[PDB]
Amino acid sequence: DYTNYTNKEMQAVTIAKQIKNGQVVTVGTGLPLIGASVAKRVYAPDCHIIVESGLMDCSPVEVPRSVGDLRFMAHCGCIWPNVRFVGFEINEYLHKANRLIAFIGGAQIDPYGNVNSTSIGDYHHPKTRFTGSGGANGIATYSNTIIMMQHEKRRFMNKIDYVTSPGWIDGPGGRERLGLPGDVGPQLVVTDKGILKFDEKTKRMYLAAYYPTSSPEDVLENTGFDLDVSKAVELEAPDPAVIKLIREEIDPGQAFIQVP
Amino acid sequence: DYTNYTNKEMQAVTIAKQIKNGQVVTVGTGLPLIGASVAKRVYAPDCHIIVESGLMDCSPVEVPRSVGDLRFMAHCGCIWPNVRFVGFEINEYLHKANRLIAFIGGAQIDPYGNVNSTSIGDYHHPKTRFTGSGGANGIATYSNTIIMMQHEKRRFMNKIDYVTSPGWIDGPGGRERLGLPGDVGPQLVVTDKGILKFDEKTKRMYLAAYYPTSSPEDVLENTGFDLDVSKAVELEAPDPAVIKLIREEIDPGQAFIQVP
Amino acid sequence: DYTNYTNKEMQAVTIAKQIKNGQVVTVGTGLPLIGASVAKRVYAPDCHIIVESGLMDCSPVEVPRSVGDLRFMAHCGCIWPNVRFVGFEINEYLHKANRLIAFIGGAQIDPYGNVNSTSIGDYHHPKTRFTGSGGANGIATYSNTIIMMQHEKRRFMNKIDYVTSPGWIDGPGGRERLGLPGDVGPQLVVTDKGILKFDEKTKRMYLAAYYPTSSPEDVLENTGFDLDVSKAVELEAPDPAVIKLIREEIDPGQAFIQVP
Amino acid sequence: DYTNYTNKEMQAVTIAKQIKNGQVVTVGTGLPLIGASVAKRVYAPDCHIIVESGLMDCSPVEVPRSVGDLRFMAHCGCIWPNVRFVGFEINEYLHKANRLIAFIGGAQIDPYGNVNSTSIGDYHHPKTRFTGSGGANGIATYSNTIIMMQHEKRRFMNKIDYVTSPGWIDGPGGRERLGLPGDVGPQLVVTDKGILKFDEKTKRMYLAAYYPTSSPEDVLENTGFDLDVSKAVELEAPDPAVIKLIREEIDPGQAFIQVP
Amino acid sequence: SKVMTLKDAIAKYVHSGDHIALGGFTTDRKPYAAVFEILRQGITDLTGLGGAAGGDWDMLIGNGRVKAYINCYTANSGVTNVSRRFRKWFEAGKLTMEDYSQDVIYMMWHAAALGLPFLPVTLMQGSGLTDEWGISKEVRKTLDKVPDDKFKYIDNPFKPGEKVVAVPVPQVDVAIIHAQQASPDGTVRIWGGKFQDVDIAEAAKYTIVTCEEIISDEEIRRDPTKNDIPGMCVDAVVLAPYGAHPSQCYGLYDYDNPFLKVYDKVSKTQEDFDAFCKEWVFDLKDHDEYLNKLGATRLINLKVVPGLGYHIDMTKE
Amino acid sequence: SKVMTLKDAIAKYVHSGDHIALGGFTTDRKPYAAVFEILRQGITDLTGLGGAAGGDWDMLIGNGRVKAYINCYTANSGVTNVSRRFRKWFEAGKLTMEDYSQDVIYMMWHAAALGLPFLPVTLMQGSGLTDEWGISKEVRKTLDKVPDDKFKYIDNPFKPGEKVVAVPVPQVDVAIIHAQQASPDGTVRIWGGKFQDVDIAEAAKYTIVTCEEIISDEEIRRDPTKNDIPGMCVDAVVLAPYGAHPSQCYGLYDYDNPFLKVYDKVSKTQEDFDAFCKEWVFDLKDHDEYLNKLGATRLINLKVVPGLGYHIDMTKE
Amino acid sequence: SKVMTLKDAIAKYVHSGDHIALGGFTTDRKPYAAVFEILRQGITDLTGLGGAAGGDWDMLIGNGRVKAYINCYTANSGVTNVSRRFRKWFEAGKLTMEDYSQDVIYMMWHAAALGLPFLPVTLMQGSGLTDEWGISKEVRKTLDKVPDDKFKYIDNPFKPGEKVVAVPVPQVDVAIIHAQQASPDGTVRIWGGKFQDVDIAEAAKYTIVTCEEIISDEEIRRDPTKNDIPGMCVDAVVLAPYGAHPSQCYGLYDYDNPFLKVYDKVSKTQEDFDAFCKEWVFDLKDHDEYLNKLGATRLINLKVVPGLGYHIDMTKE
Ligand SMILES: [Cu+2]
């Protein structure tokens, strides 16, 4: 718990710096859960974590491995049926509560944040088969999202193999015409080399910030499509008091954060 | 307890004698309730009472005045949301479980079993406004029913003012013609004078029996339409044991069975 | 569950015929427990069973094997510490509640009901060693007792090998001089051949009644000391409705009552 | 919270500084209670509070006004009958566990620690009648004690009117001469001016220290007997952190520590 | 925290011309205390699905606060078989109202909670429920808290020939429920049947919870299996012991028959009704006045006996 | 069943010149309701071990009902550090009294329950507790509910040289305790500390139990681990909600400080005291009058908050 | 914390010479896992009061680990009428043993927990229990850990002409009890009756608690009412699932009758006995080995049926 931070910790901290206080956060396990746990503990104490299996207002002790773990179930405010969860994300949109933020993952992504986590290749005869959609599709249809992605050139494609989670589709106006809620979409992309954002008026991806261990060119070199890296700023290393927290309080067993 | 049974007692014991061991009985409060109780406790110990509030497999101690009464709630096998009761009755049909028998009631009844419980006279400016459908509409659409009525000529009409709960409509094929499940409908009608059934081929009501207190003629003097009272048999008076029972255990408070 | 009653059932029924209603009964397991269970169920419904391990107001389902069994523990009114039980029997004497009756057993007995259940032979170098006193001594010091005994000539001795449970000691006045509560003593002896009592004015044992399967001479022949059998009456066979009860409701597993 | 500490606060913090990690502390309510609380929460987190009602290992949230207060009861590790508390303290001694430290108090105190809490003047026709012994008699017989007193000349006398709680009696061997456990007795005396101890060889009280607010002389002007104030050192004022604490957490309601 | 007084809860979240939803089922756990406050506050033009209603909706109607009512059933089952004020006000033609079955009412709210674009059911066909609209399309075009269409007939996309009844889903404004325990952050616990209470709390834009007791956010989470609604869904917790009186509350108290009978006969006429509302609602400053007016032993004697779940006099057992 | 009214319980089991025992500990679960009835009934010449007493024994004494008192401590700890009526009445020489330690009082009752011929303890030596008798042997020879000797010194039969203090064991006449739940047959449940309540119930010739609630003989037996006294030991169950007021009752209600303060200052003088007893005891017909006199919201606000075990105002949390 | 393995704990707090006390009642809640380690460790020359003793003291006796045994009753009640190793060794003249009535034994332990100088009882008189000493004064005098006098008749200080039996209060070095839950700080929860368990954990200088499960300190305090012993009185906490096997353990499992039957026949001879011990005790490295030897399903089929409190095969119900 010192100053030798890992790339995952850099990400998990950067995630946690985005959770405003009081907002509702949909997460799974993995890095977003770590980040949620860290904001929950320091940056935004009254934010509320909710998971797709219907577990409401979570506060885990030992970190959960799956979103239906007793690690969550026994440490939540309300244990609801899955259906009420979907009922919840939709109503938030209807209520215009505008306080929900969600995390999704994936294997490929494109300039407009459309994500694929179903399969690589032809969907009928795929090179590689993943689990499929899960609740990712509901989340990306009705929630403002933060996308967790590996920064490989082969993942940042001009066009993906399957859109399991709909982003800004094709630019301005795209979502509404496909009959998707228009004022909810991909907010930020967090990869292992930094954070990317989507233009407010063109919806196209641009580099927002890069980690100390990376640079705009590193970013450009590992992206299958062109980016506007000329606007990116370097983020700062994780506050050591936090890295201590992640290692000692949050994930001592190194289930998602392994030390050097 | 003794030889002086009331009309209501006659109806309750008659209702109890219609219940079969193993069947699911939808009830409310009143005589049907007193009917199910006496069956459960005497005639068919293993039948399962269910009410429209969502309280499944009921066994009250003291009689409930309502369907959501704690007197039912604290004494049932499971408390389900209202909607699951609708779904249950629908599924019972879909499974062709054939075991459900539901009780209903109303203000008027026509020769085909259709019943009115909403309002008398012009619906939009009624002479007499009642509570409304309740869940009897649902019960009528999907369950074989035993209708309860007061034997009054103004009640038994040819054309009721409003059809709250669908019966045999106009005759064979009618329910189908209207879109209602076809293999389900009015089976019996119990009133203060006897039990009337519905013709297998014409679905038009006819007197199937009459209490020791009545006669086929009295029934006629009180039915506002033509009845075939040629097949009617006379039922026997209630057995003291069951009267003692009803009075001293099922309803000693005379909530419904107001004893002499 | 018919008319072929066993000797143990004859005893267990005769025991049960002695439990007046409302009185407190101290028992272990074995025949007295059966008898208590039978009176409790039919002859004296509001009598109360208590056991030496501090289990108050018992109503077993499956019969217990030891007086500290969960068979008792989970089916009693009050689970008290052993000490409060001894506190209870004493106070009953102090309160002069005069409603307690207790059962004790043993290997030998004498004309005045003094019983031995510690050892046969020299207490220092005994021919046969039993468990010892248990709570038998408290019971016989402060309670009116009923003694369960085998009717062997070698058990009915003019003088026993050790007095673990004090009876009428030596006749009138004996108990008080030894500093034992004077108005509490052996009330009745129940063996496999009948019931014996103690004279009110001489405290000496006499035959009270013999079973159908026995006679006064049978009794005399299996008693190490003289008896006044000339006053005994024959008890009546067990009411068959009861034998059914013992076999079906009380001890179906034949833990203490084995059928023929 | 700030620099203006009260006399009572001085006494409480001084009491807290006498508690050791791991010891069993017998308390009641008032300053001793405020003393134990501050220790438990600050100075000795793992000491175990016990009160004379039978509530073992206590940890109150809001301060109790009584020893049987639900404020103690709902916040302890075990609720024992009164008598088990007596037995515990006796056993603590018998085991020579040497860990128990109990607090007491009274109306008068003599040079050997003997304390009066029953009555002032002729016992049979007192000038001032108090509650009586309480359990302080028991605590004095078997536990090392810290006595609390108001520093008044009429309180510190040569011969108290009544000895409710035994101290060192008259000097070495006195407790033994009277039949009281010899290796236990008054250890300290805390008052509104300083802490007085008892001479190892003569057991006669002498001033061991005095608050920043007092002086060895003031102590003298207020003690109705000769004191050796030659070894006395001056204690330091309470630390703000502990005053903030006492005020804002231990007793914000000012039940005892009535703040300025 | 979200703990607030009733006066403040109501004034802040409940407004005139609002589509409201009241929890409870006839004479069981109805939020009476909140109804009284809405009344004193003069909140009017309320449109809402009655659900299986009773005294609570009767009183709003009788006091003329309801602009549009969506009925399915209204009564204090066991006492008044038909809410007298509801029937009189409708027969006299003052109450604008619609009729769906109770099945379709409960399914409507739940479909709202679940977020369905509309509710498709195969119930209500071949009956007056579809034959006749209590509120016409011309009238509905003026009511902003009511859909233009009572319902529509549409084909089952997967079973040609068969037509289903598509009902519009309610967009509830405020939900007011009464629970046995809630906590400063919103987390609610309803012991027993929730009826439609959780659906409305989830679906409503604002939800208010009056409760018999407030416990801490930490205590309520020690066993999350007893909870029913997460706090993100509740906007105001209001402490109101016996706030469901005279309707029962599972685990706590039974219904006050004597008080229900009074209301029964009193509501037979608007003259007596208004008198009743003056004494018990408008003349009373608050819920504490109401409680004190009732009496200590009164409330105590309503108490649920462990083992029965309803009240009886054990001193006669 | 043994369920009876307070008036009847008291009149039947409690008599003048009786050695009584009252459960509770200072301001915790004291049987106040029963004390009031004993008073109205004019029961006098009561002799009994006070135990850790408070208002209950103070009131009997002040009303001059106690013929012989066996003290060890008397106060409403936290309010009145010394029961004012007890001290005045003693100083004035009206109260015949004895002093043992609290340790020896509780051990006395328990030894009674256990049936010991006498209690041997190595406590009270070298102190005024053994040096001076509050009741002399000459006085004791006239008191029939008191032993001739305050105590005796005897040798330890197993440790020569050492002498032990042999205290006489109490022969209690009537025990009156207040429990949270009892049942028609006597079975009692005391939640929390029993204090001396079970000892006295077991030892007393007659025991009376006032309770917050009566449940059925079958319900109380479903989990025998919650029970404390078997019914063979109880003679009368008396339903008396809040019958321990103003002393706390674990799991239910906290103490009424405001009522304790009133009694505090009111008892400073016999004039005011008698006035207080006229209004709250002699002018009131029964326990229901007492409850109604207090007020609905009054009692409600005494309520124990789950998690704390004592009352606080969660609307400020 | 006080959490330590059953090997470490037994080695540290138990020693030959010791006057021990074992919890539980006959075939109900006996500390078996522990009694196994005592044997397995060559611990010997122990003295103790049996209480309602079962196979536990039989195993110690038969394995010649008892110098003097204070007796009231010894039988694996139901299965073995009179323990065999026990009656054999005593019959052989190979065991030093005293007989007291069971009442006196449970008292003796109680008086010890209490702190009494000695125990006066009006029991055992006029019985051979006073007319015969098991361990003579002559043998008692040469024994460490055994009173020089079984009892002593003494006058009742308050009832002239009357004498009582005085009994020495025992000094227990180690107390071993089995409970369902315990915390790392020693707080112990025993569901159901406790027998002498709490007394001997208060009396004993050192206390070892074997428990089915261990819960956090924060957790075990959530409801103070369920705790039976404060951490202070407890030295070693050991996690030992089914540690009472083959005996019952309220709310968890029923006695293992087949097993107790094996032991019943096995213990009829020293050979069969020693053979048995070599397999079940001496040959196994630890308690886990014992559990595994038994097998999964075997343990599962001993579980208690909620509502019944014991084990019944419900698939045949
Ligand atoms: Cu060693």
Q: What angle do CA D230, D232, D238 make, to 5 degrees?
A: 165
* A198, A146 Cβ separation under 8 angstroms: no
Whole-Å CA distances, D14 to D195, D212, D227, G52 = 9, 12, 21, 51
Q: Amino acid identity, residue E268? A: K
Could you tell me the end-to-end alpha-carbon distance of chain D, in angstroms, rounded to an integer? 10
Judge: A77–E228 Cβ closer than 8 Å, yes or no: no
Q: What angle do CA B11, B14, B19 make, to 5 degrees?
A: 125
Burial of E227 (0-12, 13-18, 19+ CB in 10 A): buried
CA–CA separation, E298 and G283 (whole Å): 71
- Touch between C and F (at least 3 CB pairs under 8 Å): yes
**Interfacial G residues in 223-252 facing F (CB < 8 Å):** 225
User: Does E305 lie in the same domain as E161?
Assistant: no
In G179-242, which ranges are continuous DSSP H helix? 197-203, 217-221
CA of G33 to the centre of ligand 1 (A): 20
| Resolution of the solved structure (Å) | 2.5
Measured torsion, CA atoms of residues C15, C17, C18, C23, in degrees rounded to the nearest 10: 110
Structure tokens at D243: 């005053």
Adjacent-strand bridge partners of E188: E182, E229
Instruction: Give G5 to chain F, closest Cα distance, Å.
Output: 31
**Interfacial D residues in 75-94 facing F (CB < 8 Å):** 75, 79, 81-83, 86, 90
Contact list in C for residue G103 (CB cut-off 8 A) is: 82, 86, 135, 137-138
CA of G16 to the centre of ligand 1 (A): 7
Q: What angle do CA A32, A33, A36 make, to 5 degrees?
A: 85
- What domain count does chain E have? 2
Adjacent-strand bridge partners of G3: G237
CA–CA separation, E15 and E145 (whole Å): 13
Q: Which chains touch E (3 or more CB pairs under 8 A)?
A: A, B, F
User: Does F301 lie in the same domain as F211?
Assistant: yes
CA–CA separation, E231 and E201 (whole Å): 10
- Please list, in sequence order, all residues whose beta carbon lies within 8 angstroms of the beta carbon of residue B108, skipping any fewer than 6 positions away: B115, B116, B120, B154, B155, B156, B157, B160, B161
CA E189 to mean position of chain CA atoms: 17
DSSP C1-58: --S---HHHHHHHHHHTT--TT-EEE--SSHHHHHHHHIIIII-TT-EEEETTTEEEE
Structure tokens at F2: 């043994």
CA of G13 to the centre of ligand 1 (A): 9
Structure tokens at A204: 């196209």
Judge: C77–F113 Cβ closer than 8 Å, yes or no: no
Judge: G232–D48 Cβ closer than 8 Å, yes or no: yes
Q: Which chains touch G (3 or more CB pairs under 8 A)?
A: C, D, F
**Interfacial A residues in 9-48 facing E (CB < 8 Å):** 24, 48
How many CB atoms lie under 10 A from the CB of residue F289?
13
Any catalytic annotation for residue B52? yes
User: Does F149 lie in the same domain as F183?
Assistant: no
Adjacent-strand bridge partners of E207: E175
User: Does E101 lie in the same domain as E18?
Assistant: yes
Judge: B123–E27 Cβ closer than 8 Å, yes or no: no
CA–CA separation, G20 and D68 (whole Å): 34
CA–CA separation, E245 and E241 (whole Å): 9
Strands (E), B91-182: 101-105, 108-109, 115-116, 119-120, 128-129, 144-148
Whole-Å CA distances, E210 to A202, E181, E242, F314 = 48, 9, 10, 14
Could you tell me which chain B residue has the CA closest to the CA of E124?
B137
Q: Amino acid identity, residue B249? A: E
Residue E144 at interface with chain F, using a CB cutoff of 8 Å: no
- Touch between B and E (at least 3 CB pairs under 8 Å): yes
* G84, G268 Cβ separation under 8 angstroms: yes
Closest listed residue to residue B145, CA positions, set B137, B134, B153: B137
Structure tokens at F297: 């919201």
Instruction: Give G290 to chain D, closest Cα distance, Å.
Output: 33
- CATH number for D136: 3.40.1080.10
Judge: D74–F72 Cβ closer than 8 Å, yes or no: no
Whole-Å CA distances, G39 to D112, G7, G61, G262, G274 = 52, 11, 10, 19, 12
Among candidate residues F168, F185, F208, the one where a domain is terminated:
F168
**Interfacial F residues in 155-194 facing D (CB < 8 Å):** 162-163, 192-194
- Touch between B and G (at least 3 CB pairs under 8 Å): no
Bridge-based pairing of strands G73-74 and G52-53 is parallel
- Assign F280 to helix, strand or coil: helix
CA–CA separation, C161 and C153 (whole Å): 15
* E219, F306 Cβ separation under 8 angstroms: yes
Could you tell me which chain F residue has the CA closest to the CA of D127?
F91
- Please list, in sequence order, all residues whose beta carbon lies within 8 angstroms of the beta carbon of residue C115, skipping any fewer than 6 positions away: C104, C105, C106, C108, C109, C136, C140, C147, C149, C160, C163, C164, C165, C167
- CATH number for G135: 3.30.30.40
CA–CA separation, D169 and D90 (whole Å): 20
Residue F170 has phi, psi (to 5 degrees) of -70, 135
Which structural domain range is residue F57 located in?
Answer: 1-115+169-317
* F97, F70 Cβ separation under 8 angstroms: yes
Measured torsion, CA atoms of residues C11, C13, C18, C21, in degrees rounded to the nearest 10: 150
Whole-Å CA distances, F188 to C72, C181, F220, F230 = 19, 31, 8, 7
Contact list in G for residue D24 (CB cut-off 8 A) is: 232
Binning chain D into helix, strand and coil, the percentages to the nearest 5 are: 25, 20, 50
- What domain count does chain A have? 1
* D8, D32 Cβ separation under 8 angstroms: no
Is the link from the previous residue into F246 a cis peptide, with omega within 30 of 0? yes
Bridge-based pairing of strands E188-189 and E181-182 is antiparallel
CA–CA separation, A230 and A226 (whole Å): 12
Contacts from B8-11 at CB under 8 Å and sequence distance 24+?
A: B8/B34, B8/B256, B8/B257, B8/B258, B9/B238, B9/B243, B9/B246, B9/B257, B10/B192, B10/B211, B10/B212, B10/B213, B10/B237, B10/B238, B11/B35, B11/B148, B11/B190, B11/B191, B11/B192
Could you tell me the end-to-end alpha-carbon distance of chain B, in angstroms, rounded to an integer? 10
Cβ-Cβ contacts under 8 Å between C and G: the total is 166
Bridge-based pairing of strands G118-121 and G163-168 is antiparallel
Cβ-Cβ contacts under 8 Å between A and E: the total is 59
* Experimental method, per PDB record: X-ray
Judge: F297–E300 Cβ closer than 8 Å, yes or no: no
H or E segment and range at residue B160: none
Bridge-based pairing of strands B186-190 and B194-198 is antiparallel
CA E179 to mean position of chain CA atoms: 12
Q: How many residues does chain F have?
A: 317
CA–CA separation, C165 and C149 (whole Å): 13
- Assign F66 to helix, strand or coil: strand
**Interfacial E residues in 167-186 facing F (CB < 8 Å):** 181, 184
Q: Radius of gyration (Cα) for chain E, nearest Å? A: 20
User: Does G295 lie in the same domain as G209?
Assistant: yes
Contact list in F for residue E8 (CB cut-off 8 A) is: none
Q: Which residue has the tokens 């679960």?
A: F29
Closest listed residue to residue E95, CA positions, set E42, E57, E144: E57
Residue G219 at interface with chain D, using a CB cutoff of 8 Å: no
CA–CA separation, F273 and G131 (whole Å): 62
> Which positions of A are annotated as active-site residues?
52
Whole-Å CA distances, B231 to B196, B199, B209, B214, D251 = 10, 11, 8, 15, 88
Burial of E105 (0-12, 13-18, 19+ CB in 10 A): buried
Among candidate residues E149, E168, E187, the one where a domain is terminated:
E168
- Assign C178 to helix, strand or coil: coil
Closest listed residue to residue C200, CA positions, set C210, C189, C190, C186: C186
Instruction: Classify the C-alpha dihedral B176-B179-B184-B186 as positive or negative.
Output: negative
* B25, B206 Cβ separation under 8 angstroms: no
Whole-Å CA distances, F132 to D23, D113, D119, D123, F150 = 35, 20, 12, 8, 9
Between helix B31-38 and helix B7-16 the angle, nearest 10°, is: 50
In the 8-state DSSP scheme, what is residue F5? Answer: -
User: Does G54 lie in the same domain as G144?
Assistant: no
CA–CA separation, E120 and E112 (whole Å): 13
- Assign D104 to helix, strand or coil: strand
Q: 3-class secondary structure for D16-52?
A: HCCCCCCCEEEECCCHHHHHHHHHHHHHCCCCEEEEC
Structure tokens at G164: 């009582």
- Assign E296 to helix, strand or coil: helix
CA–CA separation, E15 and E43 (whole Å): 6
Structure tokens at D184: 């236990």
Residue G215 has phi, psi (to 5 degrees) of -120, 155
Whole-Å CA distances, B28 to B48, B65, E217 = 13, 9, 39
Q: Radius of gyration (Cα) for chain G, nearest Å? A: 20
CA–CA separation, E57 and E65 (whole Å): 10
Structure tokens at D199: 């001479």
Residue E197 at interface with chain B, using a CB cutoff of 8 Å: no
CA–CA separation, C62 and C75 (whole Å): 10
User: Does G31 lie in the same domain as G96?
Assistant: yes
CB-closest option in F3, F215, F288 to E297: F288
Whole-Å CA distances, A225 to A122, A155, E234 = 21, 10, 45
User: Does E284 lie in the same domain as E156?
Assistant: no
* C10, C211 Cβ separation under 8 angstroms: yes
Burial of D254 (0-12, 13-18, 19+ CB in 10 A): exposed
CA of G12 to the centre of ligand 1 (A): 8
Is the link from the previous residue into F306 a cis peptide, with omega within 30 of 0? no
In the 8-state DSSP scheme, what is residue D161? Answer: S
Cβ-Cβ contacts under 8 Å between C and F: the total is 59
Measured torsion, CA atoms of residues E291, E295, E296, E302, in degrees rounded to the nearest 10: -80
Judge: F156–G118 Cβ closer than 8 Å, yes or no: yes
* F215, E307 Cβ separation under 8 angstroms: yes
In the 8-state DSSP scheme, what is residue E225? Answer: G
Adjacent-strand bridge partners of G154: G164
* F75, F84 Cβ separation under 8 angstroms: no
- Assign B131 to helix, strand or coil: coil
Measured torsion, CA atoms of residues D190, D192, D194, D200, in degrees rounded to the nearest 10: -30
CB-closest option in G202, G225, G229 to D91: G202
Q: Amino acid identity, residue B42? A: V
Structure tokens at A223: 């992206």
Q: 3-class secondary structure for G62-112?
A: HCCCEEEEEECEECECCCECCCHHHHHHHHHCCCEEEECCHHHHHHHHHHH
Judge: E202–A83 Cβ closer than 8 Å, yes or no: no
Is the link from the previous residue into E246 a cis peptide, with omega within 30 of 0? yes
- Assign B186 to helix, strand or coil: strand
Structure tokens at B254: 């005379």
CB-closest option in A57, A75, A91 to E202: A91
Could you tell me which chain E residue has the CA closest to the CA of A142?
E115
CA of G32 to the centre of ligand 1 (A): 21
CA–CA separation, B34 and B28 (whole Å): 10
In the 8-state DSSP scheme, what is residue G315? Answer: G
CA–CA separation, G83 and G54 (whole Å): 7
Instruction: Give A11 to chain E, closest Cα distance, Å.
Output: 28
Closest listed residue to residue G110, CA positions, set G194, G25, G202: G202
CA–CA separation, E137 and D168 (whole Å): 99
Adjacent-strand bridge partners of G155: G163
Which structural domain range is residue B145 located in?
Answer: 1-260
In the 8-state DSSP scheme, what is residue C210? Answer: E
* F40, F14 Cβ separation under 8 angstroms: no
Q: Amino acid identity, residue A52? A: E
User: Does E102 lie in the same domain as E126?
Assistant: no
Residue D175 at interface with chain F, using a CB cutoff of 8 Å: yes
Q: Amino acid identity, residue C159? A: K
Judge: G225–D79 Cβ closer than 8 Å, yes or no: yes
Burial of C210 (0-12, 13-18, 19+ CB in 10 A): buried
Could you tell me the end-to-end alpha-carbon distance of chain F, in angstroms, rounded to an integer? 45
- Touch between D and G (at least 3 CB pairs under 8 Å): yes
